Amino acid sequence: MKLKSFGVFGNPIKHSKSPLIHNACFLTFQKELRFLGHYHPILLPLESHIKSEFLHLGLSGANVTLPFKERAFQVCDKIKGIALECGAVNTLVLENDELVGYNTDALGFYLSLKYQNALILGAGGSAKALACELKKQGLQVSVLNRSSRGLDFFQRLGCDCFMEPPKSAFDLIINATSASLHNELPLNKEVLKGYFKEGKLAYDLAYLTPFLSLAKELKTPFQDGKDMLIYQAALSFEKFSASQIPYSKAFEVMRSVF
CATH class of the missing domain: 3.40.50.10860 (Leucine Dehydrogenase, chain A, domain 1)
Structure with missing residues (x-):
């Protein structure tokens, strides 16, 4: 060949x-x-x-x-x-x-979904593609990070951008940080509990992370990155x-x- x-x-x-x-x-x-x-x-x-x-x-x-x-x-x-x-x-x-x-990544994430708004945690390439795709599908999108990194990109998309966790219910809570790679949560455990209680789906791009384990513990629907990996x-x-x-x-x- x-x-x-x-x-x-x-x-x-x-x-x-x-x-x-x-x-x-x-x-x-x-x-x-x-x-x-x-x-x-x-x-x-x-x-x-x-x-x-x-x-x-x-x-x-x-x-x-x-x-x-x-x-x-x-x-x-x-x-x-x-x-x-x-x-x-x-x-x-x-x-x-x-x-x-x-x-x-943008379409692979979409196809992986079986939601009116979403909270994305993270500011790297995965987060940027996901925000682009979710804004395009007509969800309201909030993005939460620890610094003003990537801020201009997400604001130009029309996303609500936060460094302090917004006191709001989200249908999708998406972990697009590197925390799972490192076996840690992306946010304070009690803050995440707050979101999971009111959430429809906890989604982690990693393919059981601390984020997904907490969602499991709370009986919140959860999904890891396997389907997204395959579609992308x-x-x-x-x-x-x-x-x-x-x-x-x-x-x-x-x-x-x-």
Whole structure:
């Protein structure tokens, strides 16, 4: 076969299930694609440059995870699709010798949902894409962080932005911080209890975190990041396939292997 290389840039990255599910698709769809893709995790030093590394490795495409999604948006040659409004890129493809950035987190999150308003905790690339998608669907969106980081982005979307937890009921409480990665809660336990009591769904992007365990304890409906991982990956695979394998087909393979 002709070979094409792919990977996922993150720091940390060893916990990522992206290689498992992407390689399963590359194997399954090799006849249709007429190439064999192979996908590897790439622990990127914080000081490195996504574009330079993508070119250096000779990748045909890649995903980008924490803490690099906003940087990836900055260093792409071209941004396409909903990524234009996300200020973050999680999917890279070499198209006509240009590094092109997409964002599949926004739609992957949407598709993962079985709500009138939402509280998003966090200010990184995942939070930005989720806020963009939820504002687009007509929910009221509040965002809660510890500093004024990312504030301009969310305010331009029309989000209500907070550093002190708002005394308001939210249908969706979404943990898009890095707290779960580190085995800690993203907020004071009693504050979260307040939200969970009045919430319809506690959603954590990690794929049992302290956030989800607390929701469980309180009998609040909860959802981890598994379905989102599969949909965003499937949507990325569509892009890696030059839009020849539809995300629905990739989803099936990925969900089963995961």
